[PDB]
Amino acid sequence: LIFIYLLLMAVAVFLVYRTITDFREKLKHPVMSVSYKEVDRYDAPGIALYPGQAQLLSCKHHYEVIPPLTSPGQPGDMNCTTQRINYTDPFSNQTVKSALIVQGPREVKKRELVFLQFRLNKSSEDFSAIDYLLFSSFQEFLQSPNRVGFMQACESAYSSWKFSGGFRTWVKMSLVKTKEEDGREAVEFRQETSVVNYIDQRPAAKKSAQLFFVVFEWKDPFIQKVQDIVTANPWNTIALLCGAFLALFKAAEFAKLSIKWM
Amino acid sequence: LIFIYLLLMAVAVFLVYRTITDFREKLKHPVMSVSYKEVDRYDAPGIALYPGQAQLLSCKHHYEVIPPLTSPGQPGDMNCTTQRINYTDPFSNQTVKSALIVQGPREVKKRELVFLQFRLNKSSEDFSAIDYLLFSSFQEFLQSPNRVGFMQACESAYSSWKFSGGFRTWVKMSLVKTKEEDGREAVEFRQETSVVNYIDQRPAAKKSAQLFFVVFEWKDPFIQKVQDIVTANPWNTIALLCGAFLALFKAAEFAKLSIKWM
Amino acid sequence: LIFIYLLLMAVAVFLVYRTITDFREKLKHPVMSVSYKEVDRYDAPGIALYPGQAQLLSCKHHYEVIPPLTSPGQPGDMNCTTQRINYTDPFSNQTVKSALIVQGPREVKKRELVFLQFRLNKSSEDFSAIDYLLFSSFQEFLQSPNRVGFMQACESAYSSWKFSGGFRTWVKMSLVKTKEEDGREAVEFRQETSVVNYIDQRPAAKKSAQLFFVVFEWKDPFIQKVQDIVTANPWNTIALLCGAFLALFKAAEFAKLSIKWM
């Protein structure tokens, strides 16, 4: 009887250590749940182009699925809500980096895409490109005090991309919102590029001026919500341990009935 | 005694609240499990190219790892199971969009890749590209009645890509199958592009005709099965709650022994 | 009384069956936990370029954020720890594939990037590119016996990429470490390309020699640790089941009190 009681107590202690260690492990490695919430119209995204010396020639919201034939090389109709700012980025506070903010397409369901055009007069770069950062809401920037702070924060909160000459980078930008355990939800942008070579036959002259193109489009109406989940909470652990403790008490009590039997 | 009994009852009520709220939460945010099932030979994938005015010049299944030297510009050997169809997409039912379906490589382990060539006679598009959609099984399309319905369904069930001129888009297409809770398993295609500029020195004449190239390849023999998991089920919850309720009953009964002691 | 006892026994049998089945299911589909561990300085990555006939012209570690103006076409300063090897890959053991290993950037926080230049004398390929494989630690290769075995293993442990002519493939290489249940942690590279067309105006002569460019950079200081988790372990299952068994015993005993009542 004493032997089996000691065995049961050893099982209980082993189980307590077991569950405590398993709870410690399950707190370090929370599992993630990713859910897609279809959205009919995305909030106006903010595209932070950094033209530098480049000159915008045209910007439009092509509600259609395919851009129409344009008139490249010369200035064209401007039909975008473009905001311009000059600030100093925190990572290179010494230098001032001028940006150029544009309002991206909203009608994702209707396949609305904003097509841009840029041009740069002859220079000696030999690797010409225009950076661009994407942030979730353009209106939020358009109505936020101290735009310099907002842009500096975005410089850290978003990674740097770019597009180059003789190309039409068709950036199918998409959202992925991350929720950290503290409750706040950070929003990050995913985007897949598809470079489309520019057939420069139309000028066919000594113009030969760097011409850039981009088509910012919403990949699909799904917003990928990614949130970490803590699979282990002390509540379930304590309930399970109490159930096991009672399970052991009943076995010990049945040992007394066995003693009476013998 | 009454005070401790009321305390135990309050613990029971607040704990059943705990568990019911947590269970309600755990249905909303199911956790995901991703498993890779190595496959020796993928099912013949269906590549739905939309040449438009472009003219296919060559299509082959290069069992080797590297394409050999070709004869660009002029028609070449055709060695692909190409299916042609004209239909109207649901999103643009007004217009008729002609497709061109091809049978992709199967021998993933052997690094089998299907290399295509397209050509377009001089036009005034100025951004020339050929769309292409990928669907899981080409034979399923080749033996399914009402191909128009199948293609229209695919137009919604797969995203739109394309490749452009003077390029060799080496699309390393890969599979990712999703299982929704209802039981059906939707299949989606992932594919990473690697644009390879075309060195057009060979013609070096007034031909200067848009020439496209693509190399559809299976990235690896792994099919990424993604399935959502409901971490919480009512019966684990009810068992845990019953264990906790018994654990509370035993404490209340030990309170009677304490009363006898005092 | 016998009817309710049989009902309780049937419930117990159903519950044990269901718990065993659910434990069997939860062992097949383990859930994954992905954690990002910020790293100040990545270990020197090993870039296994396969120039073939191409001739390296320059390699440098640009601690700045932007490459400076270069002197394309002619040999330049070489400031990289380049290792050269010729071996035979397992998949094509018949042929010998010569590689060229380079020491990649380490100072991720400083936006340190290694910029390379390659050149190929006139050939008849018309699709010119240089393959490159990424492996986690360059020093590990630099101090490992039988480098041929290391390279052959990497040929299977990493996928094949490449960059082409007239381009500056800005490969923002990033790390993702996978832990299989056995305990070993396989390391894989994710990398997103951004092709930047090369404006070849500077030579403007009959040189017209294939020039390749690449900028290998660390995307961000986060290492994506991906590890599978077994949500079900026999120990929780047995504790829950025996707690439910006790919950059944107490109900059966309350049935006796009900009998006494009636």
Residues A193 and A238 in one domain: no
Q: What is the SS3 assignment for C127-169?
A: CCEEEEEEECCHHHHHCCCCHHHHHHHHHHHCCCEEEECCEEE
Residues C9 and C96 in one domain: no
Residues C24 and C139 in one domain: no
Residues A80-94: b if buried by 16+ CB within 10 A, e if exposed: beebeeebebeeeee
Query: How far is the C-alpha of B37 from the C-alpha of A154, rounded, in Å?
Result: 40
- Angle, CA C175 vertex, CA C156 and CA B35 arms, to 5°: 65
Distance from chain centroid for Cα A124:
35
Strand partners, A78: A59
Taking CB atoms and an 8 Å cutoff, what residues of chain C touch B111?
Answer: 91
Which of A29, A167, A243 comes nearest C239 by C-beta? A243
In the block, which residue shows the tokens 């076995």? Answer: A251
Longest dimension (CA), chain A: 110
CB-based contact C127:C151 (threshold 8 Å): no
In the block, which residue shows the tokens 């190219």? Answer: B49
CB-based contact A187:A178 (threshold 8 Å): yes
Q: Which of C131, C164, C241 to mutate to test the interface with B (most CBs of B within 10 A)?
A: C164
- Angle, CA B47 vertex, CA B45 and CA B50 arms, to 5°: 170
Tell me if chain A has a CB within 8 Å of the CB of C123.
no
Q: Collapsing DSSP states into helix, strand and coil, what is residue B11? A: helix
Strand partners, C61: C114
Query: How far is the C-alpha of B137 from the C-alpha of B157, rounded, in Å?
Result: 13
| Environment class of B157 (CB within 10 Å of its CB; exposed 0-12, middle 13-18, buried 19+) | middle
Q: Collapsing DSSP states into helix, strand and coil, what is residue A238? A: helix
Chain A: nearest CA to B44, how far in angstroms? Answer: 25
CB contact under 8 A, A235 and B18: yes
Q: Which of A49, A46, A199 is nearest to A120 (CA)?
A: A49
Residues A235 and A224 in one domain: no
Nearest CA in chain C to B192: C192
Backbone phi, psi, residue A258, to 5°: -60, -40
Handedness of CA C78, C82, C87, C89 (dihedral sign): negative
The pair of structure tokens assigned to C96 is: 């010998």
Tell me if chain B has a CB within 8 Å of the CB of A195.
yes
Tell me if chain A has a CB within 8 Å of the CB of B196.
no
H-run or E-run covering C118: strand C113-120
Taking CB atoms and an 8 Å cutoff, what residues of chain A touch B240?
Answer: 236, 239-240, 243
Residues C163 and C255 in one domain: no
Query: How far is the C-alpha of C199 from the C-alpha of A167, rounded, in Å?
Result: 12
Q: Which of C108, C192, C199 to mutate to test the interface with A (most CBs of A within 10 A)?
A: C199
H-run or E-run covering C192: strand C185-192
Query: How far is the C-alpha of C10 from the C-alpha of C26, rounded, in Å?
Result: 24
Chain A: nearest CA to B47, how far in angstroms? Answer: 17
Q: What is the SS3 assignment for A123-188?
A: CCCCCCEEEEEEECCHHHHHCCCCHHHHHHHHHHHCCCEEEECCEEECCEEEEEEEECCCCCEEEE
Query: How far is the C-alpha of C119 from the C-alpha of C129, rounded, in Å?
Result: 10
The pair of structure tokens assigned to A216 is: 């910012």
Strand partners, A62: A113
Handedness of CA B78, B80, B83, B84 (dihedral sign): negative
Which of C29, C162, C208 comes nearest B194 by C-beta? C162
Taking CB atoms and an 8 Å cutoff, what residues of chain A touch C221?
Answer: none
Residues C168 and C137 in one domain: yes
Q: Which of B38, B79, B89, B85 is nearest to B58 (CA)?
A: B79
| Environment class of B173 (CB within 10 Å of its CB; exposed 0-12, middle 13-18, buried 19+) | buried
Which of C168, C231, C249 comes nearest A127 by C-beta? C168
Chain B: nearest CA to C243, how far in angstroms? Answer: 5
Nearest CA in chain A to C68: A125
Give the domain CATH number at C205. 2.60.470.10
CB atoms within 10 A of CB C216: 22
Residues C61 and C84 in one domain: yes
Q: Which residue type is seen at B248? A: L
Query: How far is the C-alpha of A27 from the C-alpha of A19, rounded, in Å?
Result: 12
Taking CB atoms and an 8 Å cutoff, what residues of chain A touch C31?
Answer: 31, 231
Strand partners, A75: none
Distance from chain centroid for Cα A233:
29
Q: Which of A26, A242, A245, A249 to mutate to test the interface with B (most CBs of B within 10 A)?
A: A242
Alpha-helix residue ranges (DSSP H) falling in chain C: 2-28, 138-142, 147-157, 234-261
Taking CB atoms and an 8 Å cutoff, what residues of chain B touch C243?
Answer: 239-240, 242-243, 246
Which of A32, A124, A246 comes nearest C246 by C-beta? A246
Taking CB atoms and an 8 Å cutoff, what residues of chain C touch A247?
Answer: 239, 242-243, 245-246
Residues A41 and A157 in one domain: yes
Query: How far is the C-alpha of C236 from the C-alpha of B231, rounded, in Å?
Result: 14
Q: Which of B177, B74, B64, B172 is nearest to B119 (CA)?
A: B74
Query: How far is the C-alpha of A244 from the C-alpha of B193, rounded, in Å?
Result: 55
Q: How was this structure determined?
A: cryo-EM
Give the domain CATH number at B203. 2.60.470
CB-based contact B194:B64 (threshold 8 Å): no
8-state DSSP, B181? T
Domain enclosing residue C183, as ranges:
38-228
From residue C160, alpha-carbon distances to A186, B111, B175, B240, C135 in Å are 33, 11, 18, 51, 11
Query: How far is the C-alpha of A116 from the C-alpha of A131, rounded, in Å?
Result: 13
Residues B242 and B129 in one domain: no
CB contact under 8 A, C92 and B65: yes
Residues A213-250: b if buried by 16+ CB within 10 A, e if exposed: bbbbbbbeebbbbbbbbebbeeebbebbbbbbbbbbeb
Backbone phi, psi, residue C104, to 5°: -80, 175
Residues C216 and C235 in one domain: no
Half-sphere exposure of A24 (CA within 13 A, CB side): 6
Distance from chain centroid for Cα C21:
34
Reported resolution, Å: 3.4
H-run or E-run covering A83: strand A83-87
Interface of A with B in 197-226 (CB under 8 A): 197-199, 201-202, 213, 219-220
CB-based contact A101:A84 (threshold 8 Å): yes
Distance from chain centroid for Cα B210:
31
In the block, which residue shows the tokens 């929780």? Answer: C236
Number of structural domains (chain B) is 2
8-state DSSP, B110? T
| Environment class of C130 (CB within 10 Å of its CB; exposed 0-12, middle 13-18, buried 19+) | buried
Query: How far is the C-alpha of A122 from the C-alpha of B85, rounded, in Å?
Result: 47
8-state DSSP, B90? G
Q: Which residue type is seen at A86? A: N
CB-based contact A86:B113 (threshold 8 Å): no
Chains touching C (at least 3 CB pairs under 8 A) are A, B
A-B CB pairs within 8 A amount to: 89
Nearest CA in chain A to B164: A196
Chains touching B (at least 3 CB pairs under 8 A) are A, C
Q: Virtual CA dihedral for B140, B143, B149, B152, nearest 10 degrees?
A: 40
Tell me if chain A has a CB within 8 Å of the CB of C66.
no
Query: How far is the C-alpha of B222 from the C-alpha of B36, rounded, in Å?
Result: 5
Query: How far is the C-alpha of A108 from the C-alpha of A226, rounded, in Å?
Result: 21
Q: Whole-angstrom distance between the N-terminal and C-terminal Cα of chain B?
A: 11
Residues C257 and C179 in one domain: no
Q: Which of C140, C113, C141, C115 is nearest to C198 (CA)?
A: C115
Residues B148 and B242 in one domain: no
Backbone phi, psi, residue A181, to 5°: -60, -30
Tell me if chain B has a CB within 8 Å of the CB of A235.
yes
Q: Collapsing DSSP states into helix, strand and coil, what is residue A191? A: strand
From residue A5, alpha-carbon distances to A248, A253, B44, C208 in Å are 10, 10, 65, 89
Taking CB atoms and an 8 Å cutoff, what residues of chain C touch B172?
Answer: 159
Query: How far is the C-alpha of C101 from the C-alpha of C46, rounded, in Å?
Result: 6
